């Protein structure tokens, strides 16, 4: 489909952000993962149809309770790894 690599910065850890991203990804039937980086940022790999991916990016910007998204970087690829499911990963 398309794969997005999304990096989120701001007040985005210890705020239920991974859970929020996972609920949005499952709602939008996207596959991939969300993971906290040790530098405070959140990485998101998401694969799916373009309408789902675009609307997902907008939802991510709204964040979880107490979060504040100050930046979102997105890079894209047509090469999907064929992920199923969306996981909170370590």
- In angstroms, the CA 21 to CA 59 distance is 8
Q: Is 51 a catalytic residue?
A: no
Report CA-CA distances (Å) from 78 to 5, 59, 61.
Answer: 12, 22, 23
Q: Are strands 42-48 and 2-11 parallel, antiparallel or unpaired?
A: antiparallel
- The CATH number for 11's domain is 3.30.70.100
Q: How many CB atoms lie within 10 A of CB 5?
A: 14
Domain count of the fold of the chain: 1
Q: What is the secondary structure of 17-67 as a DSSP string?
A: HHHHHHHHHHHTT-EEEEEE-TTS-EEEEEEE-HHHHHHHHHHHHH-STT-
- Resolution value in angstroms: 1.3
Q: How many CB atoms lie within 10 A of CB 7?
A: 14
DSSP designation for 15? S
Range of the domain at 77: 1-90
Q: Is 36 a catalytic residue?
A: yes
Catalytic residue (choose from 5, 11, 36, 41): 36
Catalytic residue (choose from 18, 37, 41, 62): 18
């Amino acid at each position: 489909m398309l794969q997005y690599r999304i990096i989120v910065d701001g007040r985005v850890q210890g705020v239920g952000f991974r859970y929020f991203v996972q609920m949005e990804a499952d709602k939008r039937k996207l596959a991939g993962w969300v993971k906290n980086r040790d530098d405070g940022r959140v990485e998101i790999l998401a694969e799916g149809p373009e309408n789902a991916l675009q609307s997902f990016v907008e939802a991510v910007k709204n964040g979880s309770p107490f979060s504040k998204v100050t930046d979102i970087s997105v890079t894209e690829s047509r090469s999907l790894e064929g992920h199923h499911r969306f996981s909170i990963v370590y």
